[PDB]
Design a protein around this ligand. Structure first.
Ligand SMILES: Nc1nc2c(ncn2[C@@H]2O[C@H](COP(=O)(O)CP(=O)(O)OP(=O)(O)O)[C@@H](O)[C@H]2O)c(=O)[nH]1
Ligand SMILES: Nc1nc2c(ncn2[C@@H]2O[C@H](COP(=O)(O)CP(=O)(O)OP(=O)(O)O)[C@@H](O)[C@H]2O)c(=O)[nH]1
Ligand SMILES: Nc1nc2c(ncn2[C@@H]2O[C@H](COP(=O)(O)CP(=O)(O)OP(=O)(O)O)[C@@H](O)[C@H]2O)c(=O)[nH]1
Ligand SMILES: Nc1nc2c(ncn2[C@@H]2O[C@H](COP(=O)(O)CP(=O)(O)OP(=O)(O)O)[C@@H](O)[C@H]2O)c(=O)[nH]1
Lengths: 326, 326, 326, 326
C-alpha cells in the first residue's frame, strides 16, 4: 500500500521515534516504511496500520515486550525471524535502516537487517544513533559497532553508516532526531530515482564502493553537506555523489576515487547543491571515543564498593523455606 | 474484582495500617490489594471485602489471633500456607510487599511472600519499616533483615527494599506511614505500564539488575527522589529509572550501570521528574545501626538484676498440688 | 458390511460420542466405521452391530470396563491388542482416528492406532479433542500430545492432527462435537476418491508431506476453511488441498510448498471452495497452552494442605486385625 | 434374594435404625442390604428375613446381646467372625457400611468390615455418625476415628467417610438419620451403574484416589451437594464426581485433581446436578472437635469427688461370707 522505491526500516524504539515524522510521506507515496521492534509501547499512536508494523514474537507465537537493553536476551529469536520480515515486507530498491547502538532491540535487529539485506544483494544505508548514558548502553554501543565492522569484512561489502551521537555538543535527543531526519529526507531525494543524470548503476557503485575504488571493504561513514564550503575540510573522500539544482555550479577541489552527479527536478525541495560523502578517515576517532567511554565505565565499575554479604554458613542455615533463620 | 497490574500485599498489622490508605485506589482500578495477617484486630473497618483479606489459620482450620512479636511461634504454619495465598490471590505483574521487621507476623509472612514470589519469577519490591522500641523488636528486625540478605544470595535474585525507620529524626509512626505511602504511590505510577517509553522488559531488568549489570545478587536499597538535586549525592548508583513529565529535561551527572526512561501521561499525578534509584552502598550503614541497637539491648539485658529465686528444697517441699507451703 | 474407502476409528468414549452421528452414513455406504473402546457404557444404543465394535479384553479374555482416566493402567493390554484390531477390521484407504487426549482409554488406544497405521504405511488423519478440567486430564493431554510428537519423529512420518479444545471460547462439549463432525464430514468428501482432478497419489503426498516438501517429519496441524478469506491469515502453509465446486475460482495469494486441486461432483454436498491446510506454526502455541495448564495445576497441587497423619507408633499399635486399638 | 450392585451394611443399632428405611428398596431390587449387629433388640420388626440379618455369636455358638458401649468386650469375637459375614453375605460391587463411632458394637464391627473389604479389594464408602453425650461415647468415637485413620494409612487405601454429628446445630437423631438416608440414597444412585457416561473404573479410581492423584492414602471426607452453589466454598477438592440430569450445564470453577461425569436416566429420581466431593481439609477440624470433647470430659472426670472408702482394716474384718460386720 505504498511506493517501494525507498524503504525505511525504523528498527527499535529509537528508530521508531525518529521515523515517526515520515508517516505522512508514506501516505503521499514518497517512500515505504516498516516498523521493526520487540515492543509496541512506542507504537501506540502510529498512523500506519499493522500491515506496516512487525513485532518480534517468542517461540509461542506471542509478541515480546522489549529487550530491556539486553542484547543477548532475544538474539536467537530476532536472528531467526529476520528472513520472515523481509518476505512479508519486501525491501525497497534502496533501504534505510534506522536504529540505536545502545538499546537491546534496535542494536540486534538493526545489524541483523543490514547483514541480511547486504547478503541478499540489496542496497542499504544505516542511520545510527549512539548513546553512552550507562555502562550497559556504552557496552552495547561498543559491541554493536564492532559487530557492524565485522559484518563489513565478513560480507566483503561496505556498511555505510550515518553516525550520530546523543551527547555531542550537548544536543538533546530531539536535536539528534532532527539531524537524522534531515539525513533520511536527503537520502530519500537521492534514492528517489527521479534525478536526471543519476542512474541506478551509479548509486550501486556508490554504495558498494570497492567495486570501483578497489579499496578494502569496511564500514564507511556517510556525511551530508549543503553548498560548497565542505570541500576545504574533506577534499579527499573515498567517493561522493552530489545533487545540483537548476543552473548550479559544480564542486571543485575534491579528489575522490569515485564520484556521481545528479540534477534535482525543480519541483523537488532541494535549493542548493547537496553532497553525500563517503569516508573512513574519521572511523578511528569514533572507535576511540567509544573505547574512551568503555574505559571510563570500567574504571567506575571497579570503584564500586563490595556489597555486604551474609555469611555462607548463614545461607546454609537458611535452607528452610522462606529463608528464615529465627 | 480489581485490576491486577500492580498488587499490594499489606502484610502484618504495620503493613495493613500503611496500606489502608490505598483502599480507595482499588475501587478506582488503580491496583489490586490483598491483606495478609495472622490476626483480624486491625482489619475491623476495612472497605475491601473478605475476598481481599487472608488470615492465617492453624491446623484445625481456625484463624489465628496474632503472633505477639514471636517470629518462631507460627513460622511453620505461615510458611506452609504461603503457596495457598498466591493461588487464591493471583500476584500482579508487579508486587509491592509491605511489612515490618519488628513484629512476629509481618516479619515472617513478609519474607516468606517475597521468597516465594522471587522463586516463582514474579517481580516484587518490598517496603520495609523497622522499629527498635523493645529488645524483642530489635532482635526481630536484626533477624528478619539477615533473612532477606540470605534470601537474595540463596535465590540469586536481588531483594529490592525501601527501608524505613520508626525512630529516625523523631518521626512518628504517622510520619513514617506517609513516607511509605509516597513510595508506594510512586511505585504504582512506575509499575502502571502506561508510561510511553517504558517497557515490561525495562522494569524486569531494573528489578533484576544482575541480569544486566552482572553484579552479585544481594539485597538492594530503593530510594526515590523528585527533581534533579539528588544527582550530587548519589552520582554512582547501580541502576535508576526516571519518569519525566511533558517536556522535562533529562538527568545528567549520574553514571549508573543501567538506567531507564519513562514519560508520565499528562493525566497522571506526576509533575516533576521522579527517579527510582537502586544502590547497595548504604546497606553497611543500615546493618551497623541495627547491630548497634542489638548490642545496646544485650548490654542492658546483662544489667538485669537476678530475680530472687526460692530455694530448690522449698520447691521439693511444695510438690503438693497448688504449691502450698503451710 | 460397509464401503472401506474411508474408515472412521471412533476411539474412546469421546470418540464414540463424536462418531455416533456418522452411523447413518455407514448404512448408506459413505464410509466404514469401527468403535474401539475399553468400555461398552457409551455404546448401549449404537445402530451398528457388534461386528463394528471392538472392546479391549484383559488376560482372561473378558472385556474391560474403562480405564478411569488412568493411561498407565491398561497400556500393556491395549498396545498388545492393537494388531488384532487391524486384522479383524481392515483399515480403509484413508483412516480418521478420533479420540481425546484427556481420557485414559482414548488417549492410549488412539496413539497406538495411529502409530500402527503409520508404521504399516496407511494414510491416517487424527481428530483430537483436549480437555483441561482436572490435573489428571491436563497431565494426560500433555503426555499424549508429547507422545504423538515423539511418534512423528520416531516413525519419520507426519502425524496430521485436527486439534480441538473443550474450554475454547466457552464452547460446550456439544459445540466441540459439531466442530469435529464438520471436519470429519469434509475429510470424508476429500478422501472419497470421487473428485475429478484428485488422485490417490496426490493425497498420499499431501498427508506424507516430507516426501515432497523435504521438511522434517513432525506433528502437523490440519485446518479446514470455506471460501477464500482464509488466505490472508495463513498465506504461508506447508501444503494445502482445495476442493472446488463447479465453475469456482481458484485460490490466490497462498505460497505453499505443495498444493492439490479437486473438483467436487455436483451431487456431493459441497457448495463453496473447501481448503485443507497443513501448518506447524501454531504448534508452539498449542504446546504452550498445554504447559500453562500443567503449570497451573502443579502450583495448585503444591497448595494442598497436608492431610492429618496419625502417629507411626499408633500404626504399629494397630497391627491387630481390623486396625482397632481401643 | 436381592440385587448385589450396591450393598448396604447396616452395622450396629444406629446403622440398623438408619437403614430400616431402605427395606422397601431391597424389596424393589434397588440394592442388597445386610444387618450386622451384636444384638437383636432393634431388629424385632424388620421386614427382611433372617437370611439378611447376621448376629454375632460367642464361643458357645449363642448370639450375643449387645456390647453396652464397651468396645473391648467382644472385639476378638467380632474380628474373628468378620470373614464369615463376608462369605455368607457376598459384598456388592459398591458397599456402604453404616455405623456409629460411639457404640461398642457398631464402632468395632464397622471398622473391621471396612478393613476387610478394603483388604479384599472391594469398593466401600462408610457413613458415620458420632455422638458425645457421655464420656464413654466420646472416648469410643475418638478411638474409632483414630482406628479408621490408622486403617487408611496401613492399608495404603483411603477410607471414604460421610461424617455426621448428633449434636450438630441441635439436630435430633431423626434429623441425622434423614441426612444419612439422603447421602445413602445419593450414593445408591451414583453406584447403580446405570449412568450413561460413568464406568466402573471411573468409580474405582474415584474411591481409590491415590491411584490417580498420587496423594498419600488417608481417611477422606465425602460431601454431597445439589446445584452449583457449592463450587464457591469447595473449589479445591481432591476429587469429585457429578451426576447431571438431562440437558444440564456442567460445573465450572472447581479445580480438582480428578473428576468424573455421569448422566442420570430420566426415570431415576435426580432432578438437579448432584456432586460427590472428596476432601481432607476438614479432617483437622473434626479431629480438633473430638479432642475438645475428650478434653472436656477428662476435665469433668478429674472433678469427680473421691468416693468414701471404708477402712482396709474393716475390709479385713469383713472376710466372713456376706461381708457382715456385726
Ligand atoms: N536520539 C534519541 N535517542 C533515543 C530515542 N529514544 C531512545 N533513545 C536513546 O536510545 C537508548 C535506548 O534505545 P531504545 O529506546 O531504542 C531501546 P530498544 O528499542 O533497543 O529496547 P526497548 O526499550 O525494550 O524497546 C537510550 O540511550 C535512549 O535515551 C530517540 O527518539 N532519540
Ligand atoms: N510506622 C509504623 N509502625 C507501626 C505501625 N503499626 C505498628 N507499628 C510498629 O511495628 C511494630 C509491631 O509490628 P506489627 O504492629 O506489624 C505486629 P504483627 O503484625 O507482626 O503482630 P499482630 O500485632 O499480632 O498482628 C511496633 O514497633 C509498632 O510500633 C504503623 O502503622 N506504622
Ligand atoms: N467434546 C467432548 N468431550 C468429551 C466427550 N465425552 C467426554 N469428553 C471429555 O473427555 C474427557 C474424558 O474422556 P473420555 O470420556 O473419552 C474417557 P476414556 O474413554 O478415555 O475412558 P472411559 O471413560 O473409562 O471410557 C473429559 O474431559 C470429558 O468431558 C464428548 O462427547 N465431547
Ligand atoms: N443419629 C442417631 N444416633 C443414634 C441412633 N441410635 C443410636 N444412636 C446413638 O448412638 C449411640 C449408641 O450407639 P448404638 O445405638 O449403635 C449402640 P451399639 O449398637 O454399639 O450397642 P447395642 O445398643 O447393645 O446394640 C448413642 O449416642 C445413641 O444416641 C439413631 O438411630 N440415630
Amino acid at each position: 500500500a505504498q511506493e517501494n522505491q525507498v524503504h525505511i526500516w525504523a528498527v527499535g524504539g529509537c528508530g521508531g521515534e525518529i521515523g515517526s515524522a515520515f508517516e505522512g510521506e508514506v501516505a503521499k507515496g514518497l517512500h515505504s516504511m516498516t516498523y521493526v521492534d520487540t515492543s509496541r509501547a512506542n507504537l501506540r499512536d502510529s498512523t500506519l496500520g499493522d500491515d506496516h508494523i512487525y513485532i518480534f514474537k517468542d517461540a509461542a507465537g506471542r509478541e515480546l515486550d522489549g529487550s530491556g537493553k539486553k542484547r543477548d536476551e532475544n538474539a536467537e529469536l530476532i536472528c531467526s525471524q529476520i528472513p520472515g520480515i523481509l518476505n512479508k515486507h519486501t525491501p525497497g530498491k534502496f533501504n534505510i535502516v534506522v536504529f540505536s547502538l545502545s538499546g537491546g532491540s534496535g542494536s540486534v535487529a538493526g545489524p541483523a537487517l543490514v547483514a541480511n539485506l547486504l547478503e541478499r544483494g540489496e542496497r542499504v544505508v544505516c542511520c545510527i544513533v549512539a548513546s553512552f548514558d550507562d555502562e550497559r548502553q556504552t557496552i552495547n554501543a561498543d559491541r554493536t559497532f564492532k559487530g557492524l565492522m565485522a559484518a563489513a569484512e565478513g560480507l566483503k561489502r561496505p556498511v555505510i553508516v550515518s553516525y550520530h551521537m546523543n551527547g555531542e555538543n550537548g544536543k538533546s535527543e530531539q536535536d539528534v532526531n532532527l539531524d537524522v531526519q534531515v539525513v533520511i529526507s536527503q537520502l530519500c531525494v537521492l534514492f528517489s530515482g527521479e534525478n536526471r543524470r543519476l542512474d541506478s548503476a551509479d548509486l550501486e557503485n556508490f554504495l558498494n564502493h570497492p567495486r570501483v575504488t578497489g579499496l578494502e571493504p569496511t564500514i564507511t561513514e556517510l556525511n551530508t553537506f549543503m553548498g560548497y564550503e565542505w570541500t576545504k575540510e574533506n577534499d579527499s573522500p573515498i567517493a561522493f555523489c552530489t545533487l545540483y539544482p537548476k543552473d548550479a555550479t559544480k564542486v571543485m577541489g575534491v579528489s575522490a576515487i569515485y564520484s556521481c552527479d545528479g540534477f534535482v527536478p525543480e519541483s523537488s525541495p532541494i535549493r542548493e547543491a547537496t553532497s553525500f560523502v563517503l569516508s573512513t578517515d574519521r572511523l578511528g576517532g569514533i572507535i576511540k571515543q567509544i573505547a574512551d567511554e568503555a574505559k571510563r565505565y570500567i574504571e567506575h565499575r571497579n570503584a564500586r564498593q563490595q556489597a555486604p554479604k551474609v555469611g555462607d554458613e548463614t545461607v546454609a542455615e537458611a535452607k528452610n523455606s522462606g529463608f528464615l533463620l529465627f
